[PDB]
Amino acid sequence: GYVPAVVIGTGYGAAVSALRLGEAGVQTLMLEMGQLWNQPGPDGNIFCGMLNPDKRSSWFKNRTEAPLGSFLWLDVVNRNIDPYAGVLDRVNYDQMSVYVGRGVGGGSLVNGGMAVEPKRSYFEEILPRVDSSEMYDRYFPRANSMLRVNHIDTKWFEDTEWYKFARVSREQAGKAGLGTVFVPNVYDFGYMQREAAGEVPKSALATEVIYGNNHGKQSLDKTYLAAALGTGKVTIQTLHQVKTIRQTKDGGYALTVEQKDTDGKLLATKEISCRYLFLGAGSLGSTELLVRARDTGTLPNLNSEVGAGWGPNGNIMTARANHMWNPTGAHQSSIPALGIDAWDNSDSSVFAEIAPMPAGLETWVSLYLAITKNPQRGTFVYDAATDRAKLNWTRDQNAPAVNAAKALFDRINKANGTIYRYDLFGTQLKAFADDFCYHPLGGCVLGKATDDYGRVAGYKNLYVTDGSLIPGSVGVNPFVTITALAERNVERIIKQDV
Ligand SMILES: Cc1cc2nc3c(=O)[nH]c(=O)nc-3n(C[C@H](O)[C@H](O)[C@H](O)COP(=O)(O)OP(=O)(O)OC[C@H]3O[C@@H](n4cnc5c(N)ncnc54)[C@H](O)[C@@H]3O)c2cc1C
């Protein structure tokens, strides 16, 4: 049937969009391919933890996997599973694996909560057509407030055993002249204090994060989505995957949608039409829908920039072996609190998250997720034989990112007399993981594939709202930028078009 506005997905862009449409009085349907995560599972919990993965962990796989960095300790808990509509999807392309959330809330379900604004000078470099003053004065602060961003208590941080691993890295970086910064989060740090005291059920302190948090983490279902549902104007349909998009003869849109059950069985194929169509299926999901629509002839007026400009936010993982006298602790919070900020907009920039190790025993390992400035981009191309978008990206395109990361961590190794670990990421002796992405960005870049407010070129009433808009890099963990850009864009769209 017909609904005035449809939003595809329930991630950050989509959640912003639906809230503001509902507040404006526009009846809005959200379609989400994954589940609503609100039913206790066989252990009485909604989500599985990292030490007890089960079918809830994974989107349609037949075996659980250890989180990157932790194979040596966590492979022992892996098991065969039934393919199921689980929360974390590892999407494998030829030379890149991308990790995305699937469910009501999208990646907010599975992310580490780190809520960081990009440096203004870099924002200006990457999106020169956007007025940066309005972003920093108005839309970033709106995003932070709505997301429920909060700050750790620094006294507690200094004292607690749960953050020893971060203190050890801050000291080691300090020896090399590098500074650290506290990073705000959407996990409730007050709640975390109470976990540590044994006062409330543990989540961050019970090795939960990448398959969801049973407590503590203010994912989008608690914030934007709850507010959107509260307008009375927004409905969410789950286990509904949009496959195709076409323009009806009179300028509306019609979608073909598959309804599945949690075992992946096709129940129904539906057609939904609308006046206003907002894509929030993420960098991979929105880009695939649009490249399919262009190359199969259902949206023939899309431009040649659709599919282009993809980058993995310079994501590289590395690890250092500590001296025996510098243990990182058997108890490590799952929510990072500190980063190393060596980002000066030069080619050697790095912002590195100090990541926890989920092993629950002393490993002496310090793990980092580095964000680098690497100009290489990939392209999504449509494969008509398999009806999938394929990412044209090769491992050598990450060389600049590896070199930048290596230069930084070599400085820290030299100052402290430590070495890398080479055995954390599988078979090869490899100190730098260069074939994964947690922060996919691009494919439908703002100002190139769309206008400067995400209106897709060639079409009216067709909008993209999500990480596909960002040109491959933001220099920090990206969800606050996505959220703020969506706030900026939807405000304009609703005032001018709706
Ligand atoms: C392990 C991990 C850790 C991370 N940590 C951080 C962090 O601490 N801070 C940070 O800033 N970022 C982090 N990220 C990245 C962050 O989660 C993403 O950048 C963000 O979620 C992107 O938002 P989005 O709105 O573009 O899309 P997504 O959040 O990816 O949401 C898209 C949604 O659309 C649905 N969908 C897709 N295709 C279709 C379709 N055809 N039909 C219907 N529904 C569809 C999806 O199932 C999903 O729910 C992390 C990501 C991962 C995986």
Numbering used by the authors: 9 to 506
What do the paper's sentences say?
Cholesterol oxidase (COx) (E.C 1.1.3.6) is a flavoenzyme catalysing the oxidation and isomerisation of cholesterol through a hydride transfer mechanism from the substrate to the FAD reactive center (N5) resulting in reduction of the FAD cofactor. The Type I COx is a member of the Glucose-Methanol-Choline (GMC) oxidoreductase family, members of which share a similar active site architecture despite catalysing different biochemical reactions. Density functional theory calculations also carried out as part of this study suggest that a conserved hydrogen bond from the main chain nitrogen atom of Gly120 to the FAD-N5 atom facilitates hydride transfer by re-arrangement of the lone pair of electrons on N5. One subset of flavoenzymes are the oxidoreductases which catalyse the dehydrogenation of their substrate and require oxygen for reoxidizing the reduced flavin cofactor.
Therefore, to further investigate the role of hydrogen atoms in stabilization of the flavin cofactor during redox catalysis by COx we have determined the neutron structure of a H/D-exchanged crystal of COx (H/D-COx) to 2.2 Å resolution. A single H/D-exchanged crystal of COx was used to collect both neutron and X-ray diffraction data and joint X-ray and neutron refinement of the H/D-COx structure was carried out to 2.2 Å resolution. No significant structural differences were found between the current X-ray/Neutron structure and previously determined X-ray structures of COx. Two deuterium atoms, one involved in a conserved hydrogen bond between Gly120-NH and FAD-N5 and one involved in a hydrogen bond between the conserved water molecule, Wat541, and the proposed base (Glu361) in the substrate oxidation reaction, were clearly observed in the nuclear difference density maps and provide insight into both substrate binding and hydride transfer events in COx. The neutron structure of COx reveals an intriguing conserved interaction between the amide nitrogen atom of Gly120 and N5 of the FAD cofactor resulting in an elongated main chain N-H bond length. Modeling this scenario with partial occupancies of H/D also confirmed highly occupied deuterium and resulted in residual density between the modeled H/D positions. These observations indicating the nuclear density is the result of an elongated N-D bond rather than an average of partially occupied deuterium atoms on both Gly120 and FAD-N5. The three deuterium atoms of the Lys225 side chain are clearly visible in the nuclear density maps indicating that this group has a positive charge and that the ammonium group of the side chain is statically positioned in the structure due to the interaction with the carbonyl oxygen atom of the peptide bond between Asn119 and Gly120.
